[PDB]
Amino acid sequence: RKQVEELHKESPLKDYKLVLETKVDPSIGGGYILEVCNQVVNRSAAAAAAETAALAKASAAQVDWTSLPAAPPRPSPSAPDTLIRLLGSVVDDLADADKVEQKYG
Amino acid sequence: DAVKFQTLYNVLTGKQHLKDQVPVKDCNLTAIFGASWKADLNKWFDSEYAPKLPAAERDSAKKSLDLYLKRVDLTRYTREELTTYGILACGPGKVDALTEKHLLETGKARLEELTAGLGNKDEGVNAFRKEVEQEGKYANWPAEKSKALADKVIAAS
């Protein structure tokens, strides 16, 4: 009742008299549904429990455990002049094999 | 939690492939997971999966789980170290002793290499300690363990 007339005051109309009608739901076993001045508030078990279950379901769905996470990014190689002087023509083949292994292996 | 552990059980038992061209490995799985792999896996099993189904399938499931855990513990090692340096050639029960032998032997060999290349046994031991500590730090390996291993190899030399 307190919430009923408080919502009736919060409504744009309050000078009009208020007539209250209470009904029974077989689907709802806990909580209430209140409508005043074409404004409805639903605080029921069917809604609250499903809302809390929806949060858990969404949180579980939100992550892909079957997938692999993004490894940190690799900056540029910037190979050293010493290694280049030791292996002039071979670092290209080794880098290609490194890409091949990073993709496949 | 239960979702990730069910995915884990499916992957171990082999009912599911992982969601890319990715292999199953201790590294490639514990990296996804929270590094509490075996304890939480066994706990979730004994809690939520064993009491559901009868004991008949439960025994074989626990058996297979222990087998796959041992198999991933074996999978931890690299292929080249496994095959070429002879870690697995004797067998699973001897993998541990052969790993220890290979580690001590390659440590002695690297130490002899450093001493032959540089001399100055103090300098060589220092460089070996630096190299071992850096490789441990890179392999996510305890620094105290690395120092104890290095001292052990130096004593055994």
Next chain:
Amino acid sequence: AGGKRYDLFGYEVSVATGPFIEEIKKAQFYDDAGEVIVKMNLANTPPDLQTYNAVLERILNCKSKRSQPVKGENKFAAMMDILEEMDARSGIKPNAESWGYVLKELVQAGDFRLGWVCIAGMKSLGITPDQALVDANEANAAKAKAAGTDFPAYLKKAAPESFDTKAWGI
């Protein structure tokens, strides 16, 4: 206490740039300096030459663009995009200090060819380089000369005598 600035639509424009230049100098990653330029421009305060030179200083002296690393980072390309934003977009033109910050980066990076480009561009614009940087450019050039690093190695290797889509690497 200066010549009032105006936008292309003739509207009066603010000059109080100091509070944003201080946030640029106080920045630690040189993408936040750009974000400060943006939040500065939203407030009807467009950047001036001193502000651009403060930003090039912060670029040259910062370590990385963002907190995490990024693949494809080029310390030179950001500076020369600020200079394209200077010459082309805003009409302002750089100065000896600006090209000095530019040349310091090419000295640190050792790229002596882009260095020689900057040395030539200076004198084509009347600017004169610092011999402390010219000598370091020539030193890097002599080093790469004696070392064979005058060009990369992949260019100094023989080509396929036979034409093949796989041999050429495509």
Next chain:
Amino acid sequence: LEAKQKIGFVHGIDGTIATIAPAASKVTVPYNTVLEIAVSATNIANALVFNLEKDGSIGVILLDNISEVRSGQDVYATGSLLKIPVGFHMLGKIINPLGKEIPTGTKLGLVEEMAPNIVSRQPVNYNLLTGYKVIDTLIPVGRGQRELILGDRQTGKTSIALSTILNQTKVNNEILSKNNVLSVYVSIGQRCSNVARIHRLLTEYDAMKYCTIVAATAADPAGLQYLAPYAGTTLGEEFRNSGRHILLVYDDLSKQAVSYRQISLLLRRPPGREAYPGDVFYLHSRLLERSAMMSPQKGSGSLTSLPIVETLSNDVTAYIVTNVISITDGQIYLDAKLFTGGQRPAVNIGLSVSRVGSSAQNKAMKKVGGALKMLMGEYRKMAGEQTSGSQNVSPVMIRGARCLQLFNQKGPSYFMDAIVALYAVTNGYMDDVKLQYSKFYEFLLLNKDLPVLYGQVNNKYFYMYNKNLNYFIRYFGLNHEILEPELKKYIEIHTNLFLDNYQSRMNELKSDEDLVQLKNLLYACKRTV
């Protein structure tokens, strides 16, 4: 605390749309605002108001959980316009236009906003390198520009935009995050497998960091296909107000006009020409005038737009086609006769123009584009002739054909890798070679430095290996004292080494195995280069 306001009950539902019957009379709903329908105690079906009627009934567009709608369900009202989440956290995602993320394998922005007025936007000054030489030289695309992409089915309309997205990535990784141009790909009514392959392409080439995807597939509701491009422009809102740059790619708008027609006809609007309601011009006008190059007062931000429209039998006379050519600045017309006739991208230069010109493109590109426009205007008058004067061919007849060879591509071309290849054409260094080796030429010019290999290194700096000369070329220009002579004393030696070592060996091939191998080599070079 929070009491939802109800307005009526569900009266009727016809597929994608619905009609509400209001409960009371003094209740009043706004227009274009979102409504909610309690399809169940758990879930809610969002909606939108599109019509109001003298009977008080409400014509409603539905957007979610249409199958769960019935007659008599309670209907709620938010009393606010449609909004979506916006921000940098959304980059790198495929997303329902309702803001819901689509898996793969705080702030809120209004979906329909007014455009930047005539004072709150700067003219076009900076370019947008799509990677293709025809679009970088002769049809210069800029930032804050809106350029249509016309073409028959399966001609490269999607691929030009994808190649733009893949060209901009390397640059954006180099330049700062204020001057980088991000991207949004809106797929209206497309197929989810095409969307999956696009996602995997961007993820392979790492172009997904600087791209988000607004997906409204073919199975999705027509209202969702309708409000997808507004969601895209709504994401462009934030980069406008934050001064950044951003590109929009509206995949086929014909499917958004079929969806708007479906909506309006099922809501019993009067038809018009080709059964459209009539204000689909105002529709695309609202969508596309929101594109702009924002004033420096507003951060000097931008949003480019590359809408795509399918074409039937290469006509430019259809209703929606003319209505969009009316709106967009320029257009990239792709001719099926040329796609089928070999050349790719199948750009038709006679019907593709750009209404910005030199002001968008670069100082180094102004002097090349002004020569190529003359060259192609002269080649257009002569190229109809089956070449009879094989040696008496004009230099324009040479340069034009070699330039068309360079126009033949598969993927995008880097700016430095395009200019240095076109300079040789425009100055006639590449005239002694034959037409067919014009791309293998480019390959050696960009990936196998001939004078660096054969030791003929007299140039002090100018070599194509460094790849950082792009910015000096872009800034100083080609007609400058420091860059002209080194450029000529690289290109003339490259030509001489080619003509001496490679052309001779090529012309010495007689076998069928070797000629097929050189054939496939040049086609591979025409694709990759």
